[PDB]
Amino acid sequence: MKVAVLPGDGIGPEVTEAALKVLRALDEAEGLGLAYEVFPFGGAAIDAFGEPFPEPTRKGVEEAEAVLLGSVGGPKWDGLPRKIRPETGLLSLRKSQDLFANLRPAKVFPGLERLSPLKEEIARGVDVLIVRELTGGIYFGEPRGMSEAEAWNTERYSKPEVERVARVAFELARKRRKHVVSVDKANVLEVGEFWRKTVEEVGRGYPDVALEHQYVDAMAMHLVRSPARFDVVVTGNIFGDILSDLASVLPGSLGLLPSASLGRGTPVFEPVHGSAPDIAGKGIANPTAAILSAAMMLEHAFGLVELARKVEDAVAKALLETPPPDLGGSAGTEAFTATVEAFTA
Amino acid sequence: MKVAVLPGDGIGPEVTEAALKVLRALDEAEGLGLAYEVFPFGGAAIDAFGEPFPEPTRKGVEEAEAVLLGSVGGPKWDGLPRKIRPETGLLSLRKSQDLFANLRPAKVFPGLERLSPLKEEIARGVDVLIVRELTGGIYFGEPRGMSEAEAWNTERYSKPEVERVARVAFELARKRRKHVVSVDKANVLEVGEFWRKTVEEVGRGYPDVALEHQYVDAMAMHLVRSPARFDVVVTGNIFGDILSDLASVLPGSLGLLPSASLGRGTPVFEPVHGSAPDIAGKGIANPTAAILSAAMMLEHAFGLVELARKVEDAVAKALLETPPPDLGGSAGTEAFTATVEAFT
């Protein structure tokens, strides 16, 4: 259990420090032998090494079994050359560890439906996992350029690119409700066809898992009308963006969402929220996604699924019991974390 | 007021006939001098001309001021060469008339919130219009091709391409709640940057309208968390596709959705539903989307905004008063229309 902690900027340290407080308490109670070391990353690393992902930090993650990420970015670095911008650092961490799967869970915990924008009956039972490809797609496709009267961007996918993500999706589904849904736009684009036949072809090795294809727009609507029926949803870069964001609102607020990026290298877990610079050091940040990030870390990086599910509910309990500001409450970072540590400990 | 009516297939005729009933009554009442001619289109046109968009129908829409379309497609023609499949007909109509804007309204009528997937409070008040570009984007971007190990599609946009659609959006918002929202992914793609500065640049000629920029994924979330705060939403082809569809589920049912496609040629108005061939001639089809497609026609093609808003409510009343089966009711096509033409 060697974890490389990278607090980052803004509320990163506030919230990551909360997750570590929950980790250390589980460590004491069941003695998993946690071991962690924080490393400068993001804007911090810049203000100290002129680079967002300095070698010491680069070497820190390589040697760890998992990485616990905080927030990244802010005003102090917007005016810097994209080459070393805080965000391009996230890119180098993903590229360096060949992480290509982005796991974004959207779940409604029993007794919390009321917080959802959807009807109690529609929201009840939601538990979907959008698996998104992080390396390919339109975001990186070339050629890409601008002009006085024309703009172009190409969406391109390789065979090996699609196989892995698809394999992660199935593997993942095998451990859950065994239903995978591949989402594309094969009815119009060649890339969707390609994707479809490829996934189709890789799903052969997983007969025990039910594969179902859908178009992105059809899915856009199925995820609001019947979100409770899905399990694992695998899709491309941009589509995974549009779809993870959409699903992320089904539980209520955005600061409730963890994330993991799986690949061949060291796995990365991080909240899906930003630095929120202005509210830093104000004790009002919600560590929910941070803790939830440490739970996904426990289950997908260490296998402690029984334990991850343990902190998950302790968090659910706390959100209902003593809700934080952003969810209509007075419980600040410190307080909230107290309620959670209480149960997990 | 010369209207080219294309009933199509499936429930097309059933529902198009219902909208014509509502139109003829208004025409009697205020005497707007409606004039209409039905033309064979879709499967029907195929069964009779071997083509889905025959020259006689081609010439019928050219000469009309508006086009009232029904449904298209069905089992009888799925096994045909895509070159003359019923659906490719819809594309020939579009391409022949240079229709670039695709208006797809999603609105929850007061008293019907309960039908929505959203909570009564969140759904209440929704009235959003997603204007989508129909000619450009990744759907037609070249180069596009497949291979043994590689697939590629290119999303490209021209300057003139984006101006027009942005112009439609503003002009439309001017007549509504004066709030336009452009949607892109300018934070990552060059196409989004180009679209943003272009729309930004045309919005200058519309100072009275408030422009707002958002990224497709942000919007995918805002349109379920706070749909009631938007008015006109303009976007690209693929993005308009994912967004229209998402918004279209806000109002309880699919059959309550009209749509219009504006361009340089004859404007086209049609339900956002299919042929539902097995339920044809059963009298249970809901004409709401067709009627509402006649309203949109009235406002957007003939300027009768006061009139269109008149049929709109008559429809709303009817939905609450005598609701159709798909909405939990016994009121069949014929009966529902009765309750509508009564008010209008």
GROMACS .gro file of C-alpha atoms in nm, chain B residues 29-154:
model
  126
  374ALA     CA    1  -6.293   3.157  -3.877
  375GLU     CA    2  -6.051   3.436  -3.970
  376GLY     CA    3  -6.027   3.359  -4.342
  377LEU     CA    4  -5.653   3.356  -4.407
  378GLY     CA    5  -5.720   3.196  -4.743
  379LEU     CA    6  -5.545   2.864  -4.689
  380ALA     CA    7  -5.467   2.669  -5.006
  381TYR     CA    8  -5.325   2.320  -4.993
  382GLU     CA    9  -5.235   2.025  -5.215
  383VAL     CA   10  -5.127   1.678  -5.100
  384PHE     CA   11  -4.828   1.525  -5.284
  385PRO     CA   12  -4.702   1.165  -5.270
  386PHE     CA   13  -4.379   1.145  -5.067
  387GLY     CA   14  -4.182   0.878  -4.888
  388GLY     CA   15  -4.281   0.515  -4.917
  389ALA     CA   16  -4.605   0.611  -5.087
  390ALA     CA   17  -4.421   0.806  -5.355
  391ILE     CA   18  -4.201   0.499  -5.400
  392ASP     CA   19  -4.493   0.258  -5.438
  393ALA     CA   20  -4.616   0.489  -5.714
  394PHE     CA   21  -4.314   0.650  -5.879
  395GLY     CA   22  -4.031   0.415  -5.784
  396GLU     CA   23  -3.870   0.718  -5.616
  397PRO     CA   24  -3.940   0.874  -5.274
  398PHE     CA   25  -3.921   1.236  -5.387
  399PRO     CA   26  -4.080   1.229  -5.736
  400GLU     CA   27  -4.064   1.527  -5.971
  401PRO     CA   28  -4.432   1.614  -5.917
  402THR     CA   29  -4.374   1.645  -5.541
  403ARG     CA   30  -4.037   1.807  -5.604
  404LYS     CA   31  -4.216   2.076  -5.801
  405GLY     CA   32  -4.500   2.101  -5.551
  406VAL     CA   33  -4.285   2.219  -5.263
  407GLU     CA   34  -4.087   2.451  -5.484
  408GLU     CA   35  -4.401   2.645  -5.564
  409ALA     CA   36  -4.551   2.643  -5.214
  410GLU     CA   37  -4.463   2.884  -4.935
  411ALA     CA   38  -4.450   2.611  -4.672
  412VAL     CA   39  -4.438   2.231  -4.652
  413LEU     CA   40  -4.641   2.029  -4.400
  414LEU     CA   41  -4.473   1.690  -4.365
  415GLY     CA   42  -4.602   1.380  -4.189
  416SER     CA   43  -4.413   1.058  -4.124
  417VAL     CA   44  -4.179   0.867  -4.349
  418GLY     CA   45  -4.052   0.511  -4.369
  419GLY     CA   46  -4.165   0.162  -4.280
  420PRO     CA   47  -4.107  -0.214  -4.336
  421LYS     CA   48  -4.211  -0.218  -4.703
  422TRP     CA   49  -3.894  -0.034  -4.811
  423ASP     CA   50  -3.614  -0.128  -4.571
  424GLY     CA   51  -3.476  -0.376  -4.824
  425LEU     CA   52  -3.435  -0.111  -5.094
  426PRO     CA   53  -3.112   0.052  -5.221
  427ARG     CA   54  -3.031   0.343  -4.987
  428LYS     CA   55  -3.034   0.560  -5.299
  429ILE     CA   56  -3.416   0.558  -5.297
  430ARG     CA   57  -3.493   0.448  -4.944
  431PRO     CA   58  -3.779   0.652  -4.794
  432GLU     CA   59  -3.542   0.835  -4.559
  433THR     CA   60  -3.299   0.944  -4.827
  434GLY     CA   61  -3.602   1.128  -4.959
  435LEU     CA   62  -3.606   1.352  -4.654
  436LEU     CA   63  -3.248   1.440  -4.739
  437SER     CA   64  -3.329   1.529  -5.098
  438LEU     CA   65  -3.609   1.763  -4.981
  439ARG     CA   66  -3.364   1.930  -4.742
  440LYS     CA   67  -3.083   1.957  -4.998
  441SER     CA   68  -3.314   2.083  -5.272
  442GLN     CA   69  -3.447   2.364  -5.055
  443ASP     CA   70  -3.112   2.451  -4.889
  444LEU     CA   71  -3.258   2.414  -4.539
  445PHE     CA   72  -2.966   2.485  -4.295
  446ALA     CA   73  -3.140   2.554  -3.963
  447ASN     CA   74  -3.319   2.282  -3.773
  448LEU     CA   75  -3.556   2.418  -3.510
  449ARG     CA   76  -3.638   2.163  -3.242
  450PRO     CA   77  -3.853   2.303  -2.961
  451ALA     CA   78  -3.886   2.121  -2.631
  452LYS     CA   79  -4.155   2.269  -2.412
  453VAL     CA   80  -4.350   2.160  -2.105
  454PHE     CA   81  -4.704   2.301  -2.114
  455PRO     CA   82  -4.839   2.420  -1.777
  456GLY     CA   83  -5.016   2.140  -1.593
  457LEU     CA   84  -4.828   1.862  -1.769
  458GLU     CA   85  -4.502   1.869  -1.574
  459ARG     CA   86  -4.597   1.540  -1.411
  460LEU     CA   87  -4.521   1.368  -1.744
  461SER     CA   88  -4.154   1.475  -1.734
  462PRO     CA   89  -3.865   1.263  -1.600
  463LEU     CA   90  -3.758   1.570  -1.403
  464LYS     CA   91  -3.905   1.693  -1.075
  465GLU     CA   92  -4.219   1.907  -1.100
  466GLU     CA   93  -4.019   2.212  -0.988
  467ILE     CA   94  -3.736   2.161  -1.238
  468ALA     CA   95  -3.961   2.083  -1.537
  469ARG     CA   96  -4.206   2.367  -1.469
  470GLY     CA   97  -4.145   2.657  -1.705
  471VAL     CA   98  -3.922   2.485  -1.961
  472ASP     CA   99  -3.948   2.636  -2.309
  473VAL     CA  100  -3.619   2.589  -2.493
  474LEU     CA  101  -3.546   2.610  -2.866
  475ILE     CA  102  -3.242   2.420  -2.997
  476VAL     CA  103  -3.135   2.560  -3.335
  477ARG     CA  104  -2.901   2.317  -3.508
  478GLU     CA  105  -2.686   2.347  -3.819
  479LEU     CA  106  -2.799   2.085  -4.071
  480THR     CA  107  -2.543   2.099  -4.354
  481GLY     CA  108  -2.192   2.101  -4.208
  482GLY     CA  109  -1.996   1.924  -3.938
  483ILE     CA  110  -1.841   1.581  -3.895
  484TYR     CA  111  -2.146   1.421  -4.061
  485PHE     CA  112  -2.025   1.550  -4.397
  486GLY     CA  113  -1.666   1.641  -4.322
  487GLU     CA  114  -1.403   1.503  -4.559
  488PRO     CA  115  -1.176   1.320  -4.548
  489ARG     CA  116  -1.363   1.022  -4.404
  490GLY     CA  117  -1.267   0.658  -4.442
  491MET     CA  118  -1.219   0.320  -4.281
  492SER     CA  119  -0.944   0.058  -4.283
  493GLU     CA  120  -0.835  -0.268  -4.122
  494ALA     CA  121  -0.692  -0.091  -3.816
  495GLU     CA  122  -0.786   0.275  -3.851
  496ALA     CA  123  -1.103   0.483  -3.874
  497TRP     CA  124  -1.117   0.855  -3.943
  498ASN     CA  125  -1.378   1.131  -3.970
  499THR     CA  126  -1.316   1.505  -3.987
   0.00000   0.00000   0.00000
